[PDB]
């Protein structure tokens, strides 16, 4: 079925699954985080509270045991999916922290991209900062590398940047996007990384020990920007088979890794789609849009 | 021809109740089957016991002929409707009117209740029906389109939800939500004063002095005739076993088989002692809830109860 979900008062910016594929988390302008059950009637059990600013990015851990959520109010937050309660308020960010990423399968460690001009590394236990690479400017998305030893970030200056956690210098800078990059997501290959950018083009890259020195691999057309400049986010499928993107055009764009063909431009929405979520188990799609509700498409 | 009709036993009169002071114009049975209620042209509503035939109670609120009563299956309510253009809701835990539905422009000829939602439908002589909201007394729809008094209305849960027969000789099947006529059936030549719905068959029948006709829901496709009763037909009433009672206005009552349309009995009852013979007439008939008794409300101010005959057989009373 289409299964449209509602109950959010303002835009929903972020929607993602339990890494179980059991529960649903969505969040946006309303400054709180709603949860649902993916199966049955797609019903709502819990609501997490506390974040004073807009929830700009929610992120799971790789088991699903604690929840990370970047807020507009200069703070990140980690909470207990067990309870929904705050364990840590990552303060210290000197501006709008938009992006958050918990280290997967490494020591518990977090990279946060913010509007201060720094990327910040934090340990959850110490209540203190680890490292911080002030390049010059706002960083809009951040993701680790599966070694938990490089950190990738995308901002306003269009050159995707990667730092080595040990030498702490600009390890890898990649170029070719015509305007600001808005989204990074590294496939479960640990290798292929996906980049949305409102210049209307999406790109694919690969962080390896050895890469061709110019690793701009695949390129797809279709995404849109407009006077909104909303933050646009992408994802790989669980399999690295289909790329899903949203855009300010009300069209859910589903493409393939293989033939780069347009498998879908699906209508159904009313406002810009900000985030598409793939089920880690199923062919289930969840769209978070600025029309103050969500969609549950089955393909 | 036809396969041959099922054999039904014939009915015999066994009780005659007389306490009204004007024609008896409507009759109804409680859900739980303990009492029935009659409304008469002496402006009272009497409530009788169904086992003994004793009169339990007399309610007097109307200003003229009470032309319809009904008892709601979901709430302890009795809805009555008169020629004073007023429709009433009696609450049967205090025996007093608690609600009145205003807006008809002439006498109200009949009324039915929706079985699942809480609405009322009334038909009147201004040639409209109205769908009332039981709870807020507000008229949610005025079903208009007939061109003469609307003799009768029946409503159902399936679709179409309202059938009205009127004195311009037409039947209309309406939709409740939209509030307008889907189908218009013009097969009758004379006023349609009687309509009935089969309990378990998605079909219905409509009576007129020409002949009774059967129709098939939901768009009213003709099925067959039932002829032989040449009289102004005031009522039709169907049993669950396919017996169909056709009560006329000169007193004569035919009993038919619903499925094949075979008239298996003709009752011509007698008038109460002090009556003229020009005053024999049946205005309403109602089957019991067990569908064993058949009560009739007559123009000689009596209520006659018929029960089935238990000592007859296919060879005593063969089927022609």
């Amino acid at each position: 079925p289409i299964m449209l979900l509602s109950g959010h008062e303002g835009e929903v910016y972020c929607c993602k699954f339990h890494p179980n594929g059991s529960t649903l988390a969505s969040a946006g302008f309303d400054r709180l985080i709603l949860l649902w059950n993916v199966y049955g009637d797609c019903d709502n059990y819990a609501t997490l509270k506390g974040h004073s600013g807009a929830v700009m990015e929610l992120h799971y851990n790789t088991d699903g045991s604690m929840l990370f959520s970047a807020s507009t109010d200069k703070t990140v937050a980690v909470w207990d999916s067990e309870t929904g309660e705050r364990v840590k308020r990552l303060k210290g960010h000197t501006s709008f922290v938009n992006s958050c990423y918990p280290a997967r399968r490494g020591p518990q460690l977090v990279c946060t991209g913010s509007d201060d001009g720094t990327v910040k590394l934090w340990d959850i236990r110490k209540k203190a900062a680890i490292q911080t690479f002030q390049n010059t400017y706002q960083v809009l998305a951040v993701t680790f590398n599966d070694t938990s030893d490089q950190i990738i970030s995308g901002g306003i200056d269009n050159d995707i940047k990667v730092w080595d956690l040990r030498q702490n210098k600009l390890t890898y800078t990649m170029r070719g996007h015509a305007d600001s990059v808005t989204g990074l997501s590294l496939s479960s290959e640990g290798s292929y990384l996906l980049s949305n950018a409102m210049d209307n083009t999406v790109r694919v890259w690969d962080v390896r020990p050895f890469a061709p020195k110019e690793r701009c691999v695949k390129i797809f057309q279709g995404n849109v920007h407009n006077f909104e400049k909303n933050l646009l986010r992408c994802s790989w499928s669980p399999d690295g088979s289909k790329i899903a993107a949203g855009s300010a055009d009300r069209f859910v764009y589903v493409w393939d890794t293989t033939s780069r063909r347009i498998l879908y431009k699906l209508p159904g929405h009313a406002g810009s789609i900000n985030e598409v979520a793939f089920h880690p188990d199923e062919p289930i799609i969840i769209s978070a849009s600025s029309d103050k509700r969500l969609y549950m498409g089955e393909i | 021809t036809m396969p041959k009709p099922q054999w039904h036993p014939p009915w015999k009169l066994y009780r005659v109740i007389s306490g009204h002071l004007g024609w008896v114009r409507c009759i109804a049975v409680e859900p739980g089957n303990q009492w029935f209620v009659t409304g008469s042209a002496d402006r009272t509503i009497k409530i009788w016991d169904l086992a003994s035939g004793k009169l339990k109670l007399s309610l007097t609120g109307h200003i003229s002929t009470v032309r319809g009563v009904i008892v709601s299956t979901r709430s302890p309510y009795l809805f009555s409707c008169g020629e004073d253009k007023q429709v009433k809701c009696w609450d049967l835990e205090y025996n007093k009117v608690i609600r009145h539905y205003h807006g008809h422009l002439s006498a109200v000829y009949g009324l039915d209740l929706h079985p699942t939602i809480d609405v009322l439908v009334t038909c009147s002589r201004d040639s409209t029906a109205r769908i009332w909201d039981v709870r807020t007394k507000a008229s949610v729809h005025t079903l208009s389109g007939h061109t003469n008094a609307v003799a009768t209305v029946r409503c159902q849960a399936a679709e179409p939800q309202i059938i009205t027969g009127s004195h311009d000789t037409t039947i209309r099947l309406w939709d409740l939500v939209a509030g307008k006529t889907r189908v218009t059936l013009t097969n009758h030549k004379k006023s349609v004063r009687a309509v009935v719905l089969h309990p378990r068959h998605y079909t219905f029948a409509s009576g007129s002095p020409d002949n009774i006709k059967q129709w098939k829901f939901p768009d009213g496709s003709f099925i067959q005739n039932l002829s032989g009763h040449n009289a102004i037909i005031n009522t039709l009433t169907v049993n669950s076993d396919g017996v169909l009672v056709s009560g006329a206005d000169n007193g004569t009552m035919h009993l038919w088989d619903w499925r094949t349309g075979y008239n298996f009995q003709r009752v011509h009852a007698a008038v109460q002692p002090g009556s003229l013979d020009s005053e024999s007439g049946i205005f309403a008939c109602a089957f019991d809830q067990s569908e064993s008794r058949l009560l009739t409300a007559e123009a000689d101010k009596t209520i006659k109860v018929y029960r089935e005959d238990d000592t007859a057989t296919e060879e005593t009373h063969p089927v022609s």
């Binding site: - | 036809m2 396969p3 699942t116 939602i117 609405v119 909201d133 807020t136 507000a138 008229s139 949610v140 389109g145 061109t147 849960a157 399936a158 679709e159 939800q161 037409t170 409740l176 939500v177 889907r182 189908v183 218009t184 059936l185 013009t186 097969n187 030549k189 378990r200 068959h201 998605y202 079909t203 020409d210 098939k216 829901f217 768009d219 009213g220 496709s221 003709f222 099925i223 067959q224 005739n225 499925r259 094949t260």
Partner: protein, 205 residues
Amino acid sequence: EPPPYGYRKGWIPRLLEDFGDGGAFPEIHVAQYPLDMGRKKKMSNALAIQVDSEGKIKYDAIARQGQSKDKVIYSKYTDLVPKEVMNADDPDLQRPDEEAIKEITEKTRVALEKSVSQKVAAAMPVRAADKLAPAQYIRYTPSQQGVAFNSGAKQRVIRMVEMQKDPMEPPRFKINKKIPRGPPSPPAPVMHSPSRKMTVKEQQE
């Protein structure tokens, strides 16, 4: 008749008789009007003489005048004939299963009661005036698209906001106007059984 295919050169067919059994000559640089073809005619009132899916003349049209296809219109002789449904068994006629009935009840309840609510809120008249809904946004595609107007852009998006009602303001307009009632619906066809005769003696009676 029509000259042969490939040997139809030279002749320009002007009277449709030159068409033989009909046909236009695409290679002939003349506007072929074969069997009343080509010529745009006067706009006449006659409505479309339709024909059924077997080649019958669907006179259902003239009774169905100006009406939807939801209307069921009985206008044929075959509607009068007794269908032989003397069967106690056929599952054709049995009421919808109570689940579908539950669906119809819920839908009806909804529409019914919402219209109730508006009609009774009229009978509140002291309206506990609620706030005006948030400003809506509507995106509008003019029919007159082009760069002559709209500053070359095709769509315009507009912000609807509903104007405040002054609490102390009496009604503004005269409600009570009388007019005769409209024409009814298209008269339905009178499907009777044929009339019989009344002798002179009966009319005497």
